[PDB]
Amino acid sequence: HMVVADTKSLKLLALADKVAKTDANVMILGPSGSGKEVMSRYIHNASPRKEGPFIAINCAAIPDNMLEATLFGYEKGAFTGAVQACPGKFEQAQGGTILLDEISEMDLNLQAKLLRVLQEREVERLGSRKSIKLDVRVLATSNRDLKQYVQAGHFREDLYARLNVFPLTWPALCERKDDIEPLANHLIERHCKKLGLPVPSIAPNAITKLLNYPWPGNVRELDNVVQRALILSENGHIQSEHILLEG
Ligand SMILES: Nc1ncnc2c1ncn2[C@@H]1O[C@H](COP(=O)(O)OP(=O)(O)O)[C@@H](O)[C@H]1O
């Protein structure tokens, strides 16, 4: 469930609904921590493939260089370490939506493999010559200007141009300050609901303290400050004294 309130955020959801209805590749830009994922799910849930699978994979957090292996899947013996066969994330997302989180972290070669998938609408596991028909809607995210990243020669221009049909730039928290208060209360609410506690209120002085912080870590920091405040207030009424930022 996504909560927006700023007129700037409302304009983005207005666009999001328009692409959700289609099968177009959506590219969600913006800084780290602005929740450019909870929007992809929104796009999924607003898409005709809502009832379908929703497969997410973070290309910047897959250890032991298993990004390629987990995306396409592999047969037994495709590489040293492949003791078993394994379906790829594209196969798991059949009839639904796949999210390529932080897509700017794919090596140039993996981007070439991804391109063929997008073009031919088919995938083949590592060590398999047999192609698998794919009916999958593609979403992707990046916290870096892909255009200049293409210009830097670290990203394929053709891949960028296939993913930049309908870009959406989810802005920093300080450029959408009207999102801050509803967002804070939502985070308070999800933690009290996670521990069966009644949700407490937040003081006026606390809100102002929250509004006048630039939030360099954006919503992922807001979540921290709130968790911190809930610890300090012992799940009670949050005052301007339980809110510790970085100043
Ligand atoms: N508009 C929003 N509504 C509700 N939750 C949000 C919103 N924006 C960010 N969040 C929260 O911020 C957290 C981080 O979002 P995430 O999509 O992981 O950011 P990023 O992908 O940019 O690192 C999530 O827990 C998410 O619930």
Side-chain angles (χ1 to χ4, degrees), residues 81-114:
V83 73
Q84 67 178 70
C86 185
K89 290 298 185 181
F90 276 108
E91 308 186 25
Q92 300 180 5
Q94 192 73 245
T97 302
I98 192 178
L99 171 64
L100 308 178
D101 219 333
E102 297 297 340
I103 202 178
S104 56
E105 300 300 300
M106 292 187 182
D107 50 276
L108 285 190
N109 179 74
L110 212 167
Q111 301 176 14
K113 297 189 78 69
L114 173 59

Side-chain angles (χ1 to χ4, degrees), residues 1-4 31-38 101 170 176 183 186 190 219-220:
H1 32 280
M2 163 184 286
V3 46
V4 301
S32 74
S34 12
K36 52 154 103 72
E37 162 174 3
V38 358
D101 219 333
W170 197 233
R176 51 187 180 106
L183 217 50
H186 176 261
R190 75 164 52 158
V219 190
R220 178 220 285 142

Side-chain angles (χ1 to χ4, degrees), residues 12 19 36 41 43 49 56 69 74 87 100 108 116 124-125 127 131 136 141 143 148-149 164 170 174 217:
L12 261 70
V19 248
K36 52 154 103 72
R41 249 156 177 124
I43 293 184
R49 323 171 88 101
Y74 50 97
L100 308 178
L108 285 190
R116 161 165 302 147
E124 38 203 301
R125 359 182 103 180
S131 54
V136 179
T141 69
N143 44 28
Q148 69 196 177
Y149 205 53
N164 239 254
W170 197 233
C174 60

Side-chain angles (χ1 to χ4, degrees), residues 37-106:
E37 162 174 3
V38 358
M39 160 119 306
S40 7
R41 249 156 177 124
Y42 173 81
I43 293 184
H44 175 80
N45 296 328
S47 70
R49 323 171 88 101
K50 147 170 53 27
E51 287 304 336
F54 184 78
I55 295 298
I57 166 180
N58 193 334
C59 305
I62 302 284
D64 298 337
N65 200 67
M66 290 283 295
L67 177 57
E68 172 168 349
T70 49
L71 260 181
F72 293 78
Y74 50 97
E75 295 290 347
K76 184 179 189 187
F79 54 81
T80 49
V83 73
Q84 67 178 70
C86 185
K89 290 298 185 181
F90 276 108
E91 308 186 25
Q92 300 180 5
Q94 192 73 245
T97 302
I98 192 178
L99 171 64
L100 308 178
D101 219 333
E102 297 297 340
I103 202 178
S104 56
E105 300 300 300
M106 292 187 182

